[PDB]
Please model this.
Amino acid sequence: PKMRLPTRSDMICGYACLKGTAAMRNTKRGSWYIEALAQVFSERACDMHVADMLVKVNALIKDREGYAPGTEFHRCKEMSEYCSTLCRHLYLFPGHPP
Amino acid sequence: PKMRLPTRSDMICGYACLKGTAAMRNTKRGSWYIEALAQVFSERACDMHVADMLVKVNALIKDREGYAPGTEFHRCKEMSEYCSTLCRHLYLFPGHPPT
Amino acid sequence: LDESX
Amino acid sequence: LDESX
Amino acid sequence: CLQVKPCTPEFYQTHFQLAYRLQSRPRGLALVLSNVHFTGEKELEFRSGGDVDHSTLVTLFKLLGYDVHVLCDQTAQEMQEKLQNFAQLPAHRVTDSCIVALLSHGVEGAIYGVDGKLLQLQEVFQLFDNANCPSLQNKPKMFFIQACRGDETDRGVDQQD
Amino acid sequence: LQVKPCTPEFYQTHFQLAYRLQSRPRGLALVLSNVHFTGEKELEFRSGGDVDHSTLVTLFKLLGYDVHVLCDQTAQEMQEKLQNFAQLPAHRVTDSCIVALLSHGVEGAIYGVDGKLLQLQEVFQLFDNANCPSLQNKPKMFFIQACRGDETDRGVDQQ
Model:
């Protein structure tokens, strides 16, 4: 009688947009989601776990709006989300050990 | 122009099981998920935010296994998950300020 | 015993 | 300019 | 059986700045909706133990500072109407958060009412979104869903050496 | 782009309650970017997708991952190569894994450059406890930059 595992566990998936909607991309800066992900992860992986960094990404995305005058995208929005079956904090501990 | 909001944000949803699977309920102790949720929230709402408490719930569920000898559910497993559009920590601050 | 939802 | 995926 | 350990004042003082505002009394309204006895054409098994879940959550949410609303054995149509009525309540304008717990049988993306009819979860969350529920805009909204999302049982896997 | 390092003190006070994550490399990371399409043509060139790709490759390398890259793949190629990636032997000696998928998509699936779909559930399955025992109990991160439908959120006024 040994401890067994569910078929799927310990995953975290970040989505750039919500079910049924379009994810936004800037022709020069790239995707809003990737841009935010890189900004948060580069600055905070040192002291914030991944699910909490994805919350910071959510905050950035919630606050951004589209720039595309003359199209259905001007001032448009999007919202990112993440789903998690993680069972512990996920710290990346960058640069440790030195 | 005034910043607008996306249509849906600031929600966190905890699911007892994963897409395509059944969730388990014990006839005497209730559902595995609710039992774990109440255990963790009651002891940790004081110092842990909700998404982190749902991670502790995931840990309890991952380790549980079905007890139903002679049925299709014996030694079965389930995995809870949560999805979040929260934009900051969600602390429930129980008991603060006092009553 | 454990039952499914 | 912003476009969709 | 449940006891909620209180947070310390020092904890609040060092954590309120990076968290949602959550200090109102009540902390918010909470709705616990449990279906245990089903009677439609589509037969669904009585959810024994569902009573324990219901009382456990009502108690938990009360201890956490919420004004708890309860609903038991509702049809799909009744669930939709009453959840919409709940989301539209004026009391949300003076609280800081919301909790909705749904306990029943279900399928992927939907839950059953006692009539064996389905209510899509997407329609449920929509009732509380920024467009339809202005009173809860920018406030944390928690949902807990105890319901099956399919009929496959997970046999699990052995840990590999 | 630069990744600030964590301090020894931070590691000492946090490693006990977190997933084990000290292997070097921290894990393998795969960045799969589809930018040029046309199969059903409703799949327009993803201008700016190149910036996304370069940004993630740099980020994951700086975070200590060994990065694998795939560009403009068909749905079948994605499935086969994702499976190849999940089966690599290195996963046994690393502590985590990263998979970033960037392309056009629909709810629950992403497009290959041929205009065909690969269901995300099939992707997650390749890394699950049954199919990928080498990553059992290890954190697996997925980042999906792809549409999940054609509804454009118009936004709502704040009250």
